[PDB]
Subunit: 67 residues, 12 copies
């Protein structure tokens, strides 16, 4: 029947976790069609003087393949 | 001595991670007694036109069993 | 060449996930030099009357070592 | 929002994998309401003189919690 | 054919691992029928002045589900 | 020497496991060249009134890249 | 008391998953005594013109040892 | 230089964990030479009327190979 | 709020698992303050003529850190 | 902010691990822009009469995605 | 159809990873027929005054079984 | 009896895998006594114009503690 594909992206953001997820999804929407779900694989980040510099959320994004 | 039980729930929310966790704890409180701790096992979600539609946090809820 | 070391900490907070992470980092800054990055290993917490009492994020902090 | 629960079952069958999955789902339908999805965790079995005696499929079954 | 169910329990004991395990099974027997096997998932515990205060063994208990 | 690439697909089918795998390979053949092997990563599915509604097999498909 | 041993085999077949498993078991019966149970570790395969050429199921076979 | 080999065994015993391990080692000593180390992979068991019927410890035994 | 640190130790013992664990905790209380819990990560060991020579239990010890 | 992408490649080489890795990156450079890091997932290979025929290193290559 | 068996070996070497691997395969071809592939499971080693004393690579060797 | 401790380090090097490991050991020898064994946990690295910029090997170093 239907077939899906999953790509692995790493969304980053200095705001927070949800923000990094959205950044990844925002860029994904630009070149992928029929985005359906995502799965967080990892949550890491860089440290700066104020603490968390950038939050990086590794995630898989699943989308339906046309035909 | 004491014995605990763990149930796996999946809390969802359109607002965020914490929210989805709280939603699962909220509903757990209604039928489970002596809730002690939780563990997040997965963080996934659905995608909509605006990006994240629903955040789904799969977690285990540990509670003490009565004798 | 360079060499890094990783330490495992557990930041806690009643505010949220990001907060618990910053708390760990904050305290790490006090005794460790050259903090570079962090990795989230686990996300767990305690349950109170109002739901989540305290969020506990187990994370590894990596930092550069002096030759 | 909505909250789901997952229970772990082990469906068995001498016919095959799909059969063992269905056996588990058949019994689940008897006492659980709003079954939505399943996830295969393990696939094992017992050996007899003709080879596979019983196929055992360990799976999690997710269902929506009412209210 | 047959269909089993697995619940996750955490047995505790100040004595030792084997005790923690039995503690969890003892309580399991009280409300579950047809217990068949168990699998240890984690072994952890609390620390006191004398060392290990309590041993906590997280395990899964498998049991046979009946007809209806 | 030679280099291969792996894509993650999710083949679905209402008939069975093999079927869902074939569905993913079928669609992969249409846009990928030199398909060599596959690996099943997860087996999950939806539930309907009759039990299993759709079998979903997540798998990785390996293929040789051209120079 | 009793003691078991586990060996890792890889059954193959062009028919299907169950077939590949029986093939491994069949051949195990020829040199091993007291086969008790098996565990599926991986499911993979090769790709041909018609889709799946050969299904390969990596499994562990456990059997009782003679004192 | 030296080359070792590892075999996976499952020691059983109604006494306890240490017992089950010893049982496996005892039987291993009978057909394997130069036993050096072991690694516990799993700990499970059966359940009887008095609780633990038998303790089963899955472990790998490593020994040096001759040449 | 509070912050904890975890260190990985390997307690050995010729007696048994619980012993190996206690060994590690004993040594741990000598240089670490506020020990709270432990998590067993691996269980391995050396083989001797009598079977198990020494039981080695890899565990993580978690303790609270002082702001100072 | 920035968003990266990861593709999984399998570099092969009769020379050694390091070579297999470079082989995969070399080919990666041909069609991917802004390569930043790689992570080794598996190390396997084929066996010949002389021993290792080919080393195969499965790895993930991370790269920065552009604006549009 | 065909059936393969996998054995776990640990190849050691003071030279390097690839060497350790070759060591294991060399010994393997002495008592096993039809070796086809290997999979590295772990990489560990012993420490000496000069750093790495011996590299130990745990790997699984897969070979085809003969019906007979 | 004896008690060991393990620290996680990340050796780096532009030369190779063995180099990166040695680097970490070298630096470990400077502040840790009785180094016995190491375990490789991860192998990653950065990418430059010539391919591998630097090899990074995450490993745990175990040493005996005194008393
Ligand atoms: Cl792609
Ligand atoms: Cl339940
Ligand atoms: Cl430390
Ligand atoms: Cl063997
Ligand atoms: Cs004991
Ligand atoms: Cs090398
Ligand atoms: Na958050
Ligand atoms: Na099937």
């Amino acid at each position: 029947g239907k077939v899906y594909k999953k790509v692995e992206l790493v969304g980053t953001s200095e705001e927070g976790l949800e923000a990094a997820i959205q950044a990844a999804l925002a860029r994904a929407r630009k070149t992928l069609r029929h985005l359906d779900w995502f799965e967080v694989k990892e949550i890491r980040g860089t440290i700066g003087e104020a603490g968390v510099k950038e939050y990086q959320v590794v995630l898989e994004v699943g989308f339906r393949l046309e035909e």
